[PDB]
Amino acid sequence: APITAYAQQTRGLLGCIITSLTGRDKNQVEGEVQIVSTATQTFLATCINGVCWTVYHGAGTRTIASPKGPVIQMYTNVDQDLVGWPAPQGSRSLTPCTCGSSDLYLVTRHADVIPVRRRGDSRGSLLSPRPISYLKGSSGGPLLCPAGHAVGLFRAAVCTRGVAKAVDFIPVENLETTMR
Amino acid sequence: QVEGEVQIVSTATQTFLATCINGVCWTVYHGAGTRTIASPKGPVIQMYTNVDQDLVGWPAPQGSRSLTPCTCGSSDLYLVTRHADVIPVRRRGDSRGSLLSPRPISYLKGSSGGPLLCPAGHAVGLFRAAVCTRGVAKAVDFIPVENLETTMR
């Protein structure tokens, strides 16, 4: 705190495909959130507690391209819509929120920090609504407490006419459950 | 091509800060007066002047990006100095906040027109003056952000 974010592209569409297929990736890794792509779509992956998490509906059951070729998921939980790999060498993990605050902040693939009010386990509302397209590709990004600790990962948007007004998310608790 | 939200600016006499919010580069009247801001196409005139609120604004220059006004209403604030130090500050009233750790006044010189950001790093106000006992700055006066939005209208 204050939570501020920036974004860096590290790869081109061409290099992404080649790397997808070979599974071998020698680029160096930094930061807590990774921007990641399959061939079909692109989304976010968040490192918490030494594991790199992201939405299952994005990754399916894929390996992640690493310096040593493809890496199998450590954890898979189709029902949480949740998936995990060992955090890439050089990333930094977030720690789970324990203040239990209800003022959340969602990090966006565009490196925006937008405030969210918690309204339940896995549901919170946006203080100012946004076009649903603004959020596409942010699935798997973190929600933070005012301290900058992980409260949850962004799963899905609650909307009508293409305007999102609330977000649905995987709470940090569910991660711990999925580890056990 | 990194862009800054906060510019470090200078007159012949003083040296202080400006902050881009919503396309406009604001700062303090007691620093700026009614001066123009320099550009490589020549001077650019103030877009807003509000002598009451110690508030002046030009069109945001090149190599700048704007902040968004804070909308979470949190009371936990962070002042940014002209040395890019961050100072935690607890919101009292509308324009008063108190340093969770008070410190030497020299530590905030050149910083009026700096921003105060919420947890989300969104803009809460511009910093105007220091509340202080001898030697030591203890709380801060700041132009709140709604003042900017309603100078804009």
């Binding site: 501020t4 070979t22 792509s37 390996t63 493809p70 | -």
Partner: peptide, 21 residues
């Protein structure tokens, strides 16, 4: 089926800085 790939990063741990000249 193809591997998931990192193509960018977001950095939170950065703190305010004077843009170097």
């Amino acid at each position: 089926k193809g591997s998931v790939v990192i193509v960018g990063r977001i950095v939170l741990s950065g703190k305010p800085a004077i843009i170097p000249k």
